[PDB]
mmCIF file of all heavy atoms in Angstrom:
data_model
loop_
_atom_site.group_PDB
_atom_site.id
_atom_site.type_symbol
_atom_site.label_atom_id
_atom_site.label_comp_id
_atom_site.label_asym_id
_atom_site.label_seq_id
_atom_site.Cartn_x
_atom_site.Cartn_y
_atom_site.Cartn_z
ATOM 1 N N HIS A 1 33.965 0.617 -12.199
ATOM 2 C CA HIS A 1 32.562 0.709 -12.601
ATOM 3 C C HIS A 1 31.921 -0.633 -12.291
ATOM 4 O O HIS A 1 32.113 -1.615 -13.025
ATOM 5 C CB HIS A 1 32.423 1.084 -14.071
ATOM 6 C CG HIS A 1 33.156 2.339 -14.430
ATOM 7 N ND1 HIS A 1 34.423 2.332 -14.973
ATOM 8 C CD2 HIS A 1 32.814 3.641 -14.291
ATOM 9 C CE1 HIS A 1 34.825 3.575 -15.164
ATOM 10 N NE2 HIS A 1 33.866 4.390 -14.762
ATOM 11 N N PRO A 2 31.144 -0.714 -11.207
ATOM 12 C CA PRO A 2 30.844 -2.025 -10.605
ATOM 13 C C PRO A 2 30.158 -3.015 -11.528
ATOM 14 O O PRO A 2 30.427 -4.219 -11.434
ATOM 15 C CB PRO A 2 29.945 -1.662 -9.418
ATOM 16 C CG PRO A 2 30.244 -0.246 -9.106
ATOM 17 C CD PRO A 2 30.710 0.413 -10.365
ATOM 18 N N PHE A 3 29.277 -2.559 -12.418
ATOM 19 C CA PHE A 3 28.524 -3.515 -13.217
ATOM 20 C C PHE A 3 29.371 -4.199 -14.279
ATOM 21 O O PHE A 3 28.878 -5.127 -14.929
ATOM 22 C CB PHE A 3 27.316 -2.844 -13.867
ATOM 23 C CG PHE A 3 26.289 -2.375 -12.882
ATOM 24 C CD1 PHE A 3 25.584 -1.207 -13.097
ATOM 25 C CD2 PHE A 3 26.004 -3.124 -11.755
ATOM 26 C CE1 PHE A 3 24.632 -0.783 -12.197
ATOM 27 C CE2 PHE A 3 25.057 -2.698 -10.849
ATOM 28 C CZ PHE A 3 24.372 -1.527 -11.071
ATOM 29 N N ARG A 4 30.612 -3.764 -14.478
ATOM 30 C CA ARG A 4 31.534 -4.506 -15.326
ATOM 31 C C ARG A 4 31.674 -5.929 -14.806
ATOM 32 O O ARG A 4 31.894 -6.143 -13.610
ATOM 33 C CB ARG A 4 32.896 -3.810 -15.354
ATOM 34 C CG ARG A 4 32.936 -2.542 -16.187
ATOM 35 C CD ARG A 4 34.055 -1.623 -15.724
ATOM 36 N NE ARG A 4 35.137 -1.530 -16.696
ATOM 37 C CZ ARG A 4 35.358 -0.476 -17.469
ATOM 38 N NH1 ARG A 4 34.581 0.593 -17.418
ATOM 39 N NH2 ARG A 4 36.385 -0.495 -18.313
ATOM 40 N N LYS A 5 31.541 -6.905 -15.706
ATOM 41 C CA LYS A 5 31.496 -8.299 -15.278
ATOM 42 C C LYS A 5 32.805 -8.762 -14.652
ATOM 43 O O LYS A 5 32.809 -9.758 -13.923
ATOM 44 C CB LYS A 5 31.130 -9.199 -16.457
ATOM 45 C CG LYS A 5 29.699 -9.020 -16.933
ATOM 46 C CD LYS A 5 28.736 -9.863 -16.113
ATOM 47 C CE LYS A 5 27.558 -9.039 -15.620
ATOM 48 N NZ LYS A 5 26.587 -8.742 -16.710
ATOM 49 N N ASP A 6 33.913 -8.070 -14.920
ATOM 50 C CA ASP A 6 35.171 -8.414 -14.267
ATOM 51 C C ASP A 6 35.222 -7.919 -12.827
ATOM 52 O O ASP A 6 35.967 -8.476 -12.012
ATOM 53 C CB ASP A 6 36.352 -7.859 -15.066
ATOM 54 C CG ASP A 6 36.290 -6.351 -15.244
ATOM 55 O OD1 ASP A 6 35.474 -5.687 -14.571
ATOM 56 O OD2 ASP A 6 37.069 -5.824 -16.067
ATOM 57 N N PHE A 7 34.456 -6.885 -12.502
ATOM 58 C CA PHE A 7 34.448 -6.356 -11.147
ATOM 59 C C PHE A 7 33.913 -7.410 -10.183
ATOM 60 O O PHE A 7 32.887 -8.042 -10.470
ATOM 61 C CB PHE A 7 33.595 -5.092 -11.075
ATOM 62 C CG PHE A 7 33.934 -4.192 -9.923
ATOM 63 C CD1 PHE A 7 35.023 -3.341 -9.989
ATOM 64 C CD2 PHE A 7 33.162 -4.195 -8.776
ATOM 65 C CE1 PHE A 7 35.334 -2.510 -8.931
ATOM 66 C CE2 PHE A 7 33.469 -3.367 -7.715
ATOM 67 C CZ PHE A 7 34.556 -2.525 -7.792
ATOM 68 N N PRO A 8 34.568 -7.634 -9.047
ATOM 69 C CA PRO A 8 34.105 -8.673 -8.124
ATOM 70 C C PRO A 8 32.790 -8.293 -7.468
ATOM 71 O O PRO A 8 32.429 -7.118 -7.376
ATOM 72 C CB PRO A 8 35.235 -8.757 -7.095
ATOM 73 C CG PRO A 8 35.802 -7.384 -7.078
ATOM 74 C CD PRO A 8 35.706 -6.878 -8.497
ATOM 75 N N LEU A 9 32.071 -9.319 -7.012
ATOM 76 C CA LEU A 9 30.771 -9.095 -6.389
ATOM 77 C C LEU A 9 30.906 -8.239 -5.137
ATOM 78 O O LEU A 9 30.111 -7.319 -4.912
ATOM 79 C CB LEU A 9 30.122 -10.434 -6.044
ATOM 80 C CG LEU A 9 28.604 -10.584 -6.176
ATOM 81 C CD1 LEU A 9 28.188 -12.006 -5.819
ATOM 82 C CD2 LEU A 9 27.828 -9.564 -5.371
ATOM 83 N N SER A 10 31.914 -8.522 -4.315
ATOM 84 C CA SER A 10 32.084 -7.861 -3.029
ATOM 85 C C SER A 10 32.820 -6.533 -3.132
ATOM 86 O O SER A 10 33.024 -5.880 -2.102
ATOM 87 C CB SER A 10 32.829 -8.785 -2.064
ATOM 88 O OG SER A 10 32.470 -10.139 -2.279
ATOM 89 N N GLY A 11 33.220 -6.119 -4.327
ATOM 90 C CA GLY A 11 33.988 -4.902 -4.462
ATOM 91 C C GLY A 11 35.430 -5.101 -4.030
ATOM 92 O O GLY A 11 35.951 -6.218 -3.981
ATOM 93 N N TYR A 12 36.083 -3.985 -3.707
ATOM 94 C CA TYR A 12 37.486 -4.002 -3.325
ATOM 95 C C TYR A 12 37.764 -3.484 -1.926
ATOM 96 O O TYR A 12 38.756 -3.908 -1.323
ATOM 97 C CB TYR A 12 38.321 -3.174 -4.314
ATOM 98 C CG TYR A 12 38.585 -3.876 -5.618
ATOM 99 C CD1 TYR A 12 37.871 -3.553 -6.762
ATOM 100 C CD2 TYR A 12 39.546 -4.867 -5.705
ATOM 101 C CE1 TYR A 12 38.113 -4.197 -7.957
ATOM 102 C CE2 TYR A 12 39.797 -5.509 -6.893
ATOM 103 C CZ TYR A 12 39.078 -5.176 -8.017
ATOM 104 O OH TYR A 12 39.325 -5.823 -9.205
ATOM 105 N N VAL A 13 36.937 -2.591 -1.396
ATOM 106 C CA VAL A 13 37.263 -1.896 -0.156
ATOM 107 C C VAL A 13 35.974 -1.578 0.585
ATOM 108 O O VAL A 13 35.020 -1.059 -0.003
ATOM 109 C CB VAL A 13 38.074 -0.616 -0.441
ATOM 110 C CG1 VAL A 13 37.691 -0.041 -1.794
ATOM 111 C CG2 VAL A 13 37.856 0.408 0.645
ATOM 112 N N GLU A 14 35.948 -1.889 1.875
ATOM 113 C CA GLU A 14 34.833 -1.535 2.738
ATOM 114 C C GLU A 14 35.218 -0.321 3.576
ATOM 115 O O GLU A 14 36.310 0.230 3.438
ATOM 116 C CB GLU A 14 34.436 -2.719 3.618
ATOM 117 C CG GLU A 14 35.607 -3.564 4.072
ATOM 118 C CD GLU A 14 35.780 -4.800 3.225
ATOM 119 O OE1 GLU A 14 35.602 -4.702 1.993
ATOM 120 O OE2 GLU A 14 36.079 -5.873 3.790
ATOM 121 N N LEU A 15 34.322 0.102 4.462
ATOM 122 C CA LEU A 15 34.632 1.204 5.360
ATOM 123 C C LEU A 15 34.017 0.930 6.722
ATOM 124 O O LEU A 15 32.987 0.259 6.831
ATOM 125 C CB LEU A 15 34.139 2.546 4.812
ATOM 126 C CG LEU A 15 32.949 2.525 3.859
ATOM 127 C CD1 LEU A 15 32.066 3.726 4.122
ATOM 128 C CD2 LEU A 15 33.437 2.526 2.422
ATOM 129 N N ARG A 16 34.662 1.457 7.757
ATOM 130 C CA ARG A 16 34.214 1.221 9.125
ATOM 131 C C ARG A 16 34.854 2.252 10.047
ATOM 132 O O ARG A 16 35.816 2.928 9.678
ATOM 133 C CB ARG A 16 34.547 -0.202 9.579
ATOM 134 C CG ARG A 16 36.003 -0.579 9.397
ATOM 135 C CD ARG A 16 36.712 -0.549 10.730
ATOM 136 N NE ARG A 16 38.157 -0.692 10.614
ATOM 137 C CZ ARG A 16 38.998 -0.597 11.635
ATOM 138 N NH1 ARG A 16 38.569 -0.360 12.863
ATOM 139 N NH2 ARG A 16 40.302 -0.742 11.416
ATOM 140 N N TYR A 17 34.304 2.361 11.254
ATOM 141 C CA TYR A 17 34.833 3.283 12.253
ATOM 142 C C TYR A 17 36.255 2.907 12.648
ATOM 143 O O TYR A 17 36.587 1.728 12.792
ATOM 144 C CB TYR A 17 33.957 3.270 13.506
ATOM 145 C CG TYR A 17 33.922 4.571 14.279
ATOM 146 C CD1 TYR A 17 32.958 4.792 15.252
ATOM 147 C CD2 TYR A 17 34.898 5.542 14.100
ATOM 148 C CE1 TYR A 17 32.940 5.956 15.989
ATOM 149 C CE2 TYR A 17 34.880 6.717 14.822
ATOM 150 C CZ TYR A 17 33.900 6.920 15.764
ATOM 151 O OH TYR A 17 33.881 8.087 16.490
ATOM 152 N N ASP A 18 37.095 3.920 12.848
ATOM 153 C CA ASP A 18 38.399 3.750 13.471
ATOM 154 C C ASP A 18 38.564 4.837 14.522
ATOM 155 O O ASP A 18 38.472 6.031 14.206
ATOM 156 C CB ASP A 18 39.528 3.812 12.440
ATOM 157 C CG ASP A 18 40.778 3.100 12.910
ATOM 158 O OD1 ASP A 18 40.650 2.097 13.643
ATOM 159 O OD2 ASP A 18 41.889 3.541 12.548
ATOM 160 N N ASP A 19 38.781 4.417 15.772
ATOM 161 C CA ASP A 19 39.000 5.363 16.860
ATOM 162 C C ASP A 19 40.406 5.941 16.824
ATOM 163 O O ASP A 19 40.622 7.070 17.280
ATOM 164 C CB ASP A 19 38.744 4.685 18.204
ATOM 165 C CG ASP A 19 37.419 5.084 18.817
ATOM 166 O OD1 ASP A 19 36.612 5.732 18.118
ATOM 167 O OD2 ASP A 19 37.183 4.749 19.996
ATOM 168 N N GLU A 20 41.370 5.181 16.300
ATOM 169 C CA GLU A 20 42.736 5.671 16.168
ATOM 170 C C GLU A 20 42.803 6.966 15.374
ATOM 171 O O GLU A 20 43.650 7.818 15.660
ATOM 172 C CB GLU A 20 43.602 4.607 15.498
ATOM 173 C CG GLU A 20 45.074 4.940 15.449
ATOM 174 C CD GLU A 20 45.937 3.771 15.863
ATOM 175 O OE1 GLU A 20 45.666 2.640 15.408
ATOM 176 O OE2 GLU A 20 46.880 3.980 16.647
ATOM 177 N N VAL A 21 41.928 7.127 14.386
ATOM 178 C CA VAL A 21 41.812 8.374 13.641
ATOM 179 C C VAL A 21 40.477 9.063 13.862
ATOM 180 O O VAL A 21 40.279 10.172 13.341
ATOM 181 C CB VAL A 21 42.047 8.147 12.134
ATOM 182 C CG1 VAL A 21 43.503 7.811 11.875
ATOM 183 C CG2 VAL A 21 41.164 7.025 11.649
ATOM 184 N N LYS A 22 39.562 8.450 14.617
ATOM 185 C CA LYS A 22 38.270 9.046 14.966
ATOM 186 C C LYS A 22 37.425 9.341 13.730
ATOM 187 O O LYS A 22 36.790 10.392 13.632
ATOM 188 C CB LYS A 22 38.454 10.315 15.804
ATOM 189 C CG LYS A 22 39.494 10.203 16.904
ATOM 190 C CD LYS A 22 39.097 11.026 18.116
ATOM 191 C CE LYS A 22 37.859 10.458 18.785
ATOM 192 N NZ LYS A 22 38.205 9.460 19.833
ATOM 193 N N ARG A 23 37.407 8.411 12.776
ATOM 194 C CA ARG A 23 36.600 8.625 11.578
ATOM 195 C C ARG A 23 36.333 7.296 10.891
ATOM 196 O O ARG A 23 36.947 6.275 11.207
ATOM 197 C CB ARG A 23 37.275 9.589 10.594
ATOM 198 C CG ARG A 23 38.791 9.577 10.634
ATOM 199 C CD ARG A 23 39.376 10.381 9.488
ATOM 200 N NE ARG A 23 39.542 9.560 8.295
ATOM 201 C CZ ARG A 23 40.599 8.796 8.055
ATOM 202 N NH1 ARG A 23 41.626 8.754 8.888
ATOM 203 N NH2 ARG A 23 40.631 8.064 6.945
ATOM 204 N N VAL A 24 35.394 7.323 9.947
ATOM 205 C CA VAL A 24 35.185 6.173 9.078
ATOM 206 C C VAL A 24 36.325 6.101 8.074
ATOM 207 O O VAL A 24 36.666 7.096 7.421
ATOM 208 C CB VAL A 24 33.821 6.259 8.379
ATOM 209 C CG1 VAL A 24 33.853 5.520 7.054
ATOM 210 C CG2 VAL A 24 32.753 5.662 9.262
ATOM 211 N N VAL A 25 36.923 4.922 7.953
ATOM 212 C CA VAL A 25 38.085 4.709 7.106
ATOM 213 C C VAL A 25 37.791 3.576 6.140
ATOM 214 O O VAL A 25 36.968 2.695 6.410
ATOM 215 C CB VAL A 25 39.340 4.391 7.939
ATOM 216 C CG1 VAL A 25 39.666 5.553 8.838
ATOM 217 C CG2 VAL A 25 39.105 3.141 8.765
ATOM 218 N N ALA A 26 38.489 3.605 5.010
ATOM 219 C CA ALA A 26 38.346 2.612 3.956
ATOM 220 C C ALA A 26 39.473 1.595 4.063
ATOM 221 O O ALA A 26 40.645 1.967 4.171
ATOM 222 C CB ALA A 26 38.360 3.281 2.582
ATOM 223 N N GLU A 27 39.113 0.318 4.028
ATOM 224 C CA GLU A 27 40.052 -0.776 4.196
ATOM 225 C C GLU A 27 39.896 -1.794 3.079
ATOM 226 O O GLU A 27 38.793 -1.997 2.559
ATOM 227 C CB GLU A 27 39.850 -1.478 5.545
ATOM 228 C CG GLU A 27 40.002 -0.571 6.746
ATOM 229 C CD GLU A 27 39.855 -1.318 8.052
ATOM 230 O OE1 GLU A 27 39.176 -2.365 8.067
ATOM 231 O OE2 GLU A 27 40.428 -0.861 9.061
ATOM 232 N N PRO A 28 40.986 -2.466 2.708
ATOM 233 C CA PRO A 28 40.891 -3.526 1.700
ATOM 234 C C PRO A 28 39.996 -4.656 2.181
ATOM 235 O O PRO A 28 39.873 -4.915 3.379
ATOM 236 C CB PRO A 28 42.343 -3.991 1.531
ATOM 237 C CG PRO A 28 43.170 -2.857 2.048
ATOM 238 C CD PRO A 28 42.371 -2.256 3.157
ATOM 239 N N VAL A 29 39.364 -5.329 1.217
ATOM 240 C CA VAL A 29 38.305 -6.275 1.538
ATOM 241 C C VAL A 29 38.848 -7.447 2.341
ATOM 242 O O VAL A 29 39.918 -7.997 2.045
ATOM 243 C CB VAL A 29 37.617 -6.755 0.251
ATOM 244 C CG1 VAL A 29 38.638 -7.324 -0.700
ATOM 245 C CG2 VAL A 29 36.546 -7.786 0.568
ATOM 246 N N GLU A 30 38.112 -7.819 3.387
ATOM 247 C CA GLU A 30 38.409 -9.030 4.147
ATOM 248 C C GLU A 30 37.075 -9.581 4.641
ATOM 249 O O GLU A 30 36.574 -9.155 5.687
ATOM 250 C CB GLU A 30 39.361 -8.749 5.298
ATOM 251 C CG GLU A 30 39.817 -10.004 6.005
ATOM 252 C CD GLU A 30 41.001 -9.767 6.911
ATOM 253 O OE1 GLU A 30 42.044 -9.291 6.416
ATOM 254 O OE2 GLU A 30 40.891 -10.059 8.119
ATOM 255 N N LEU A 31 36.510 -10.516 3.886
ATOM 256 C CA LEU A 31 35.202 -11.060 4.214
ATOM 257 C C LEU A 31 35.262 -11.902 5.481
ATOM 258 O O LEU A 31 36.293 -12.490 5.817
ATOM 259 C CB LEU A 31 34.675 -11.908 3.057
ATOM 260 C CG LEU A 31 34.635 -11.237 1.685
ATOM 261 C CD1 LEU A 31 35.130 -12.190 0.612
ATOM 262 C CD2 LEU A 31 33.228 -10.759 1.373
ATOM 263 N N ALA A 32 34.140 -11.940 6.198
ATOM 264 C CA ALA A 32 33.975 -12.881 7.296
ATOM 265 C C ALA A 32 33.531 -14.252 6.814
ATOM 266 O O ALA A 32 33.783 -15.253 7.493
ATOM 267 C CB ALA A 32 32.968 -12.339 8.313
ATOM 268 N N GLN A 33 32.871 -14.320 5.660
ATOM 269 C CA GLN A 33 32.529 -15.594 5.038
ATOM 270 C C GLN A 33 32.456 -15.349 3.539
ATOM 271 O O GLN A 33 31.728 -14.457 3.092
ATOM 272 C CB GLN A 33 31.202 -16.145 5.578
ATOM 273 C CG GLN A 33 30.320 -16.963 4.612
ATOM 274 C CD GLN A 33 31.030 -18.072 3.826
ATOM 275 O OE1 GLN A 33 32.233 -18.303 3.959
ATOM 276 N NE2 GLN A 33 30.275 -18.738 2.964
ATOM 277 N N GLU A 34 33.209 -16.132 2.773
ATOM 278 C CA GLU A 34 33.328 -15.919 1.339
ATOM 279 C C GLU A 34 32.063 -16.351 0.603
ATOM 280 O O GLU A 34 31.397 -17.319 0.978
ATOM 281 C CB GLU A 34 34.533 -16.686 0.797
ATOM 282 C CG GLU A 34 34.347 -17.241 -0.600
ATOM 283 C CD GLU A 34 35.496 -18.113 -1.032
ATOM 284 O OE1 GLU A 34 36.544 -18.090 -0.361
ATOM 285 O OE2 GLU A 34 35.358 -18.818 -2.048
ATOM 286 N N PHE A 35 31.742 -15.623 -0.467
ATOM 287 C CA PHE A 35 30.604 -15.960 -1.317
ATOM 288 C C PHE A 35 30.851 -17.306 -1.980
ATOM 289 O O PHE A 35 31.787 -17.456 -2.771
ATOM 290 C CB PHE A 35 30.384 -14.874 -2.365
ATOM 291 C CG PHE A 35 29.186 -15.106 -3.240
ATOM 292 C CD1 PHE A 35 27.962 -14.543 -2.917
ATOM 293 C CD2 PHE A 35 29.280 -15.873 -4.389
ATOM 294 C CE1 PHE A 35 26.856 -14.747 -3.717
ATOM 295 C CE2 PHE A 35 28.178 -16.082 -5.190
ATOM 296 C CZ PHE A 35 26.964 -15.519 -4.854
ATOM 297 N N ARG A 36 30.013 -18.286 -1.664
ATOM 298 C CA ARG A 36 30.096 -19.567 -2.343
ATOM 299 C C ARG A 36 29.489 -19.442 -3.734
ATOM 300 O O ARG A 36 28.324 -19.060 -3.879
ATOM 301 C CB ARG A 36 29.376 -20.642 -1.535
ATOM 302 C CG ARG A 36 29.650 -20.586 -0.043
ATOM 303 C CD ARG A 36 29.202 -21.866 0.648
ATOM 304 N NE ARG A 36 27.770 -21.882 0.926
ATOM 305 C CZ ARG A 36 27.165 -21.124 1.830
ATOM 306 N NH1 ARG A 36 27.842 -20.280 2.591
ATOM 307 N NH2 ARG A 36 25.847 -21.219 1.979
ATOM 308 N N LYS A 37 30.279 -19.750 -4.756
ATOM 309 C CA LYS A 37 29.835 -19.656 -6.143
ATOM 310 C C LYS A 37 29.363 -21.038 -6.578
ATOM 311 O O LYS A 37 30.170 -21.921 -6.878
ATOM 312 C CB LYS A 37 30.946 -19.117 -7.040
ATOM 313 C CG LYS A 37 32.311 -19.745 -6.821
ATOM 314 C CD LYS A 37 33.156 -19.660 -8.080
ATOM 315 C CE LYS A 37 32.516 -20.419 -9.230
ATOM 316 N NZ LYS A 37 32.367 -21.866 -8.924
ATOM 317 N N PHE A 38 28.049 -21.225 -6.601
ATOM 318 C CA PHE A 38 27.485 -22.515 -6.968
ATOM 319 C C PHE A 38 27.631 -22.758 -8.465
ATOM 320 O O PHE A 38 27.553 -21.829 -9.273
ATOM 321 C CB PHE A 38 26.017 -22.582 -6.558
ATOM 322 C CG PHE A 38 25.794 -22.390 -5.087
ATOM 323 C CD1 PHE A 38 25.479 -21.143 -4.577
ATOM 324 C CD2 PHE A 38 25.908 -23.455 -4.213
ATOM 325 C CE1 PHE A 38 25.276 -20.965 -3.224
ATOM 326 C CE2 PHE A 38 25.704 -23.283 -2.861
ATOM 327 C CZ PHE A 38 25.390 -22.036 -2.365
ATOM 328 N N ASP A 39 27.849 -24.021 -8.831
ATOM 329 C CA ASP A 39 28.041 -24.405 -10.228
ATOM 330 C C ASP A 39 26.729 -24.963 -10.772
ATOM 331 O O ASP A 39 26.502 -26.172 -10.838
ATOM 332 C CB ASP A 39 29.188 -25.402 -10.356
ATOM 333 C CG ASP A 39 30.538 -24.768 -10.088
ATOM 334 O OD1 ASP A 39 30.590 -23.777 -9.331
ATOM 335 O OD2 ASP A 39 31.547 -25.258 -10.638
ATOM 336 N N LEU A 40 25.854 -24.043 -11.168
ATOM 337 C CA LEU A 40 24.596 -24.348 -11.838
ATOM 338 C C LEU A 40 24.840 -24.606 -13.320
ATOM 339 O O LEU A 40 25.959 -24.955 -13.708
ATOM 340 C CB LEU A 40 23.590 -23.214 -11.632
ATOM 341 C CG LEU A 40 23.342 -22.840 -10.168
ATOM 342 C CD1 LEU A 40 24.048 -21.547 -9.799
ATOM 343 C CD2 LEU A 40 21.854 -22.734 -9.884
ATOM 344 N N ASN A 41 23.784 -24.516 -14.133
ATOM 345 C CA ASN A 41 23.838 -24.665 -15.593
ATOM 346 C C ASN A 41 24.364 -26.053 -15.988
ATOM 347 O O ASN A 41 25.448 -26.239 -16.535
ATOM 348 C CB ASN A 41 24.578 -23.474 -16.247
ATOM 349 C CG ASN A 41 26.088 -23.439 -15.990
ATOM 350 O OD1 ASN A 41 26.860 -24.235 -16.522
ATOM 351 N ND2 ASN A 41 26.507 -22.497 -15.154
ATOM 352 N N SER A 42 23.515 -27.039 -15.682
ATOM 353 C CA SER A 42 23.700 -28.456 -15.977
ATOM 354 C C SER A 42 24.286 -28.684 -17.365
ATOM 355 O O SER A 42 23.960 -27.954 -18.310
ATOM 356 C CB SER A 42 22.367 -29.195 -15.856
ATOM 357 O OG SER A 42 21.664 -29.170 -17.086
#
């Protein structure tokens, strides 16, 4: 349930085309650039 504060921002699994199976498939998360978590709240 995504809005749970423990759930990560990026989720767990994305989806994309795969020609090997000729369909959109779900894959474990692998970001191209990680979310930088800034340390605000002086």
Side-chain angles (χ1 to χ4, degrees):
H1 305 96
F3 294 144
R4 286 156 111 106
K5 291 276 130 75
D6 58 12
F7 203 80
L9 216 178
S10 325
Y12 283 102
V13 30
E14 36 261 40
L15 26 143
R16 53 104 189 175
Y17 210 166
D18 204 33
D19 256 10
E20 187 134 45
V21 290
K22 316 214 67 90
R23 30 171 272 275
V24 153
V25 298
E27 301 183 334
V29 55
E30 187 166 303
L31 306 137
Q33 147 49 0
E34 145 186 347
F35 183 94
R36 317 194 279 290
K37 46 154 298 299
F38 301 95
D39 290 28
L40 306 104
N41 70 72
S42 88

